Design a protein around this ligand. Structure first.
Ligand SMILES: [Ca+2]
Ligand SMILES: [Ca+2]
Ligand SMILES: [Ca+2]
Ligand SMILES: [Ca+2]
Ligand SMILES: [Ca+2]
Ligand SMILES: [Ca+2]
Ligand SMILES: [Ca+2]
Ligand SMILES: [Zn+2]
Lengths: 468, 100
């Protein structure tokens, strides 16, 4: 049934609550956020949480023969490309939390700094490490090391972050540390043989946080060989805990994916081949997840803290806690689109989609193909504030009422009558030729008046257009 | 602190996928499948026996190795455990990938 599809998607990646995954405890979005910040070190002081902060950053002119505190040499200033990408990563952190970054000239004292290194000791090239950084307030041998980030420029992705997403992710990750974040588990590159087995909680993968070292596939995600460029779901929780949630971000009507008006490279795509991977942070307005240009079958869930399978990837798109996205547009593949308690506009596009508006007054469009419109609660669409199916195709599309039957523990519960008696499960279909609207009334709770109403633009054949 | 991402080049070569006593010889090539994936050569028959599907591509990751379908979607990811890469099936069966 169309309902089963919806049900699967609503129970995709459940977490916390004593769940055990991969032999590890499952942490919730909130627990994971606090754990990633276990060091309690912030730019506002030890254990000073939730205050905004304004930091400076620079790209110092390191001389090749110098040696940094870590004993690395063969240094250099960030190239133009590296500086460009580093500024994009900085911004993505500023988008989610109350952090204000301002660049100071190379030579001015800055909180966060970037530099390349290429040798572990004079004349010896280091082709093994990737990068490292020091958390704020890191006192070592009488001096503060906090905010320094170092990258091994011998690695092509570090040298070319703009064309190699792993390099871009490395910048965001190291900046996470410089801001106060730790790996979600106690492991460190090169320190022995750390593996996913050393994690504290199951959600310690790249699917949930870019501070993690482990493949998103460990929890079932699949990013097709790409790496998120901006803070993921658990990252957002961690950083918002430290410096507060940025309630000024994208407070207008924002579109993510295709036809985006975000002005963020990671929240936008212009082709089916450009896949997106992001965790949405939006502070207001009427927003839309536009995934129309993708030809793959997609699953879009508009509930906060949930995962969607977008553009052919798995668990690549999510919505941060406290965020309300209102509309979603599927692509040409067969999609499953689930709304939330807000009034949503869901469009399936081509292909055979399943649409579920949930609560509130939704407007649904199946588009081309044989689509299914799913209902599971009378209050989903109550008379006087009903859902609207804007393009029903008689004999092609279907209305799924099966849930009410399963819930009533009887298949013959829902039954079409020509006149209401006040009996429960009575369904009544009437057509308005003046407006070309079919009105579907159902009396779920056996009331004097029906408690469920769906207004459908078009005609419905009761003999073929229903799933019960 | 981050892990480095190996190159297709350094991981390419002759590998053996060891399953329920079976062994498939596969060649992880540097031929390009797509933007983030390279080509893999091997006996599909053999591969079907040890994996949920015969993969056609692969790619290194900082923590392991991913065997993919023609469109790049993951068939099986093998984590690096010291000297070998291992993957567990839905039923918990282990599959090992070791460079010959
Ligand atoms: Ca907005
Ligand atoms: Ca909104
Ligand atoms: Ca569709
Ligand atoms: Ca809704
Ligand atoms: Ca459709
Ligand atoms: Ca249709
Ligand atoms: Ca509704
Ligand atoms: Zn790190």
């Amino acid at each position: 049934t169309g309902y089963d599809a919806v049900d699967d998607l609503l129970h995709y990646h459940e977490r916390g609550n004593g769940i055990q995954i991969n032999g590890k405890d499952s942490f919730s979005n909130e627990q994971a956020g606090l754990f990633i910040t276990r060091e309690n070190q912030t730019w506002n002081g030890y254990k000073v949480f939730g205050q905004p902060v304004k930091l400076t950053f620079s790209f110092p002119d390191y001389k090749f023969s110098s040696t940094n505190v870590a004993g690395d040499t063969g240094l250099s200033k960030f190239s133009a490309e590296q500086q460009q990408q580093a500024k994009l990563s900085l911004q993505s952190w500023a988008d989610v939390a109350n952090i204000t970054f301002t660049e100071v000239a190379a030579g001015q004292k800055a909180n966060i700094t970037f530099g390349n290194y290429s040798q572990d000791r004079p004349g010896h090239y280091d082709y093994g490490t990737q990068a490292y950084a020091f958390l704020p307030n890191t006192i070592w041998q009488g001096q503060d090391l906090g905010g320094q980030t170092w990258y091994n420029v011998n690695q092509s992705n570090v040298k070319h972050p703009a064309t190699e997403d792993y390099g871009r992710q490395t910048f965001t990750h190291e900046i996470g540390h410089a801001l106060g974040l730790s790996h979600p588990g106690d492991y460190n590159a090169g320190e022995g043989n750390p593996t996913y087995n050393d994690v504290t909680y199951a959600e310690d993968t790249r699917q949930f946080s870019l501070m993690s070292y482990w493949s998103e596939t460990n929890t079932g995600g699949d990013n097709g060989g790409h790496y998120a460029a901006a803070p993921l779901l658990d990252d957002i929780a961690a950083i918002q805990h430290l410096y507060g949630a940025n309630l000024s971000t994208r407070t207008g009507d924002t579109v993510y994916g295709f036809n985006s008006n975000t002005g963020r490279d990671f929240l936008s795509t212009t082709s089916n081949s450009q896949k997106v991977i992001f965790a949405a942070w939006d502070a207001g307005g009427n927003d839309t997840f536009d995934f129309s240009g993708y030809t793959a079958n997609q699953r879009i869930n508009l509930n906060e803290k949930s995962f969607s399978d977008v553009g052919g990837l798995k668990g690549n798109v999510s919505i941060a806690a406290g965020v309300t996205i209102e509309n979603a547009i599927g692509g040409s593949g067969n999609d499953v689109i689930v709304g939330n308690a807000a009034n949503n506009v869901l469009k399936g596009g081509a292909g055979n989609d399943v649409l579920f508006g949930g609560g509130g007054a939704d407007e649904l469009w199946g588009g081309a193909g044989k689509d299914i419109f799913v209902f599971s609660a009378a209050s989903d669409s109550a008379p006087g504030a009903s859902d609207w199916i804007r393009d029903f195709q008689k004999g092609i599309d279907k209305i799924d009422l099966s849930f009410f039957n399963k819930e009533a523990n009887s298949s013959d519960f829902i039954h079409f009558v020509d006149h209401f008696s006040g009996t429960a499960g009575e369904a009544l279909l009437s057509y308005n030729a003046s407006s070309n609207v079919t009105d579907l009334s159902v009396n779920i709770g056996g009331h004097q008046a029906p408690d469920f109403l769906v207004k459908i633009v078009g005609q419905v054949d009761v003999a073929t257009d229903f799933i019960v | 602190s981050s892990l480095r991402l190996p190159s297709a080049a350094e991981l390419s070569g002759q590998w053996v996928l060891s399953g329920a006593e079976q062994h498939c010889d596969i060649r992880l090539n540097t031929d390009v499948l797509d933007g983030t994936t390279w080509k893999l050569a091997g006996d599909t028959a053999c591969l079907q026996k040890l994996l949920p599907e015969a993969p056609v591509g692969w790619r290194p990751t900082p923590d392991g190795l991913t065997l993919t379908q023609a469109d790049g979607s993951a068939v099986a990811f093998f984590s690096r455990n010291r000297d070998r890469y291992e993957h567990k099936l839905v039923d918990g069966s282990v599959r090992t990938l070791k460079k010959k």
